[PDB]
Design a protein around this nucleic acid. Structure first.
Ligand SMILES: O=c1nc[nH]c2c1ncn2[C@H]1C[C@H](O)[C@@H](COP(=O)(O)OP(=O)(O)OP(=O)(O)O)O1
Ligand SMILES: [Ca+2]
Length: 426
DNA sequence: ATTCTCACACT
DNA sequence: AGTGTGAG
């Protein structure tokens, strides 16, 4: 009822794509470097930045050319392109390396290519018996921060982390195997081993957050990045939330979180607490207001889905500006290339994960429209065959063509999207 | 001119 | 089925 039933962790690879390239290209280790795609336009678009390049101001979405302006010594690894489009195979396969290690300790929800939530509730219960009732040495937690500690009556980072960890472990009630703080602590000892196993078995370093739910875990993980883990206890939530901007909380990063700020006239997550649940529901709907009411008291029940494998496999490409596709055979040729990349990933999925997709979603964007997708249409995926898929995807879109000429496409297409869905056992 | 995934609520 | 939001 105080949102302390579970022990949940979120593990997040540090500058992941960069690390995959650094393990592979030793010359890039401990240097400012980014991973780019499409070198031709403004040197390439940056999709990942090491921590040494972040110190210079280089960010994602920046053009490599522009990053070179902020950081002249910046080293670049460019993504493999296949069929004219960026190919992430290398990163997906490094990701499977980690997911399989993590999955030896507890059941995982894959959250992205490089983050995963862990429910440690049963594992913690198993260790709490094996541990008799003996103290938890600080040597079990060599990279753990305790959020909100030290407090009360050293000038270097490692000095502060130790003191906070000392105070936490001192006031720790190791005789009471049902106290939620002691469970987080044992969750944190498990994440330490999990993280040591990941770095040993892959060379990949990661940060992690430990708390009682997914949202507090995600936030905690970002508090002491890179290569560290943060425990956030229920007790720390009032002070943590009291100056936490609303947009930092997962799902509040967008238009909803902006309405909360404007409608309620607040800036910080802790300001939500003064409102009744019914007031929050009248403003944002039953589900959103219920969710906010509990979340601002550190309580959320969205759980760790037992799911390590994506649910849709999709292939898309943007054609911005003067590169928009304007002729029918252009559209035909790119749909083919997408279906091919899509085929290559579907058959690898059928062999590894014992399933087949059964519906083909095709989406397109017309020059002049506003939104991610202009139009969605679907059809049957019966055969993993690139030429049928592209033939079928064209068929279910050819009548979007406002043009009167057969050979031309108007309005020209600025995005093409093919997505396999509705998997079944095989 | 970032681009590219993937998930889910609502209808 | 098709649209819209959110996040990595
Ligand atoms: O806006 C984005 N547009 C396209 N792709 C994106 C975007 N944002 C994240 N991604 C994908 C690829 C990225 O390599 C991976 C890791 O994302 P993410 O955890 O936010 O950053 P990161 O691992 O590169 O470094 P860090 O964790 O230290 O912030 O997610
Ligand atoms: Ca990351």
């Amino acid at each position: 009822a105080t949102g302390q039933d579970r022990v949940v962790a979120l593990v997040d690879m540090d500058c992941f794509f960069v690390q995959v390239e650094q393990r592979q290209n030793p010359h890039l280790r401990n240097k400012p470097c980014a991973v780019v795609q499409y070198k031709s336009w403004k040197g390439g678009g940056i999709i990942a930045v090491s921590y040494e390049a972040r110190a210079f101001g280089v960010t994602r979405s920046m053009w490599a050319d522009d990053a070179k302006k902020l950081c002249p010594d910046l080293l670049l690894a460019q993504v493999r392109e296949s069929r004219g489009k960026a190919n992430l195979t290398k990163y997906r396969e490094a990701s499977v390396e980690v997911m399989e290690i993590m999955s030896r300790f507890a059941v995982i929800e894959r959250a992205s290519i490089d983050e995963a939530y862990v429910d440690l509730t049963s594992a913690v219960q198993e260790r709490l018996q094996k541990l008799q009732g003996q103290p938890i040495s600080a040597d079990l937690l060599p990279s753990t921060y305790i959020e909100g500690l030290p407090q009360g009556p050293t000038v270097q980072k490692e000095g502060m982390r130790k003191q906070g960890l000392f105070q936490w472990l001192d006031s720790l009630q190791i005789d009471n195997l049902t106290s939620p703080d002691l469970q987080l602590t044992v969750g944190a000892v498990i994440v330490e081993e999990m993280r040591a196993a990941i770095e040993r078995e892959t060379g990949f370093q990661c940060s992690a957050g430990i708390s009682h739910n997914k949202v507090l875990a995600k936030l905690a993980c970002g508090l002491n990045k890179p290569n560290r883990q943060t425990l956030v206890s229920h007790g720390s939530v009032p002070q943590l939330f009291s100056q936490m901007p609303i947009r930092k909380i997962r799902s509040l990063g967008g238009k909803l979180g902006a309405s909360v700020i404007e409608i309620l006239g607040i800036e910080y997550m802790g300001e939500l607490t003064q409102f009744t649940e019914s007031q929050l529901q009248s403003h944002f709907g039953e589900k959103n207001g219920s969710w906010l009411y509990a979340m601002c008291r550190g309580i959320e029940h969205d759980p760790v889905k037992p799911r390590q494998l994506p649910k849709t496999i999709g292939c898309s490409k943007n054609f911005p500006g003067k590169t928009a596709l304007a002729t029918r055979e252009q559209v035909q040729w790119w749909l083919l290339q997408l279906a091919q990349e899509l085929e290559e990933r579907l058959t690898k999925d059928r062999n590894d994960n014992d399933r087949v997709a059964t519906q083909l979603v095709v989406s397109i964007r017309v020059q002049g429209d506003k939104r991610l997708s202009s139009l969605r249409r679907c059809c049957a995926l019966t055969r993993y065959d690139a030429h049928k898929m592209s033939h079928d995807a064209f068929t279910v879109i050819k009548n979007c063509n406002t043009s009167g000429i057969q050979t031309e496409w108007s309005p020209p297409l600025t995005m093409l999207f093919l997505c396999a869905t509705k998997f079944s056992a095989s």
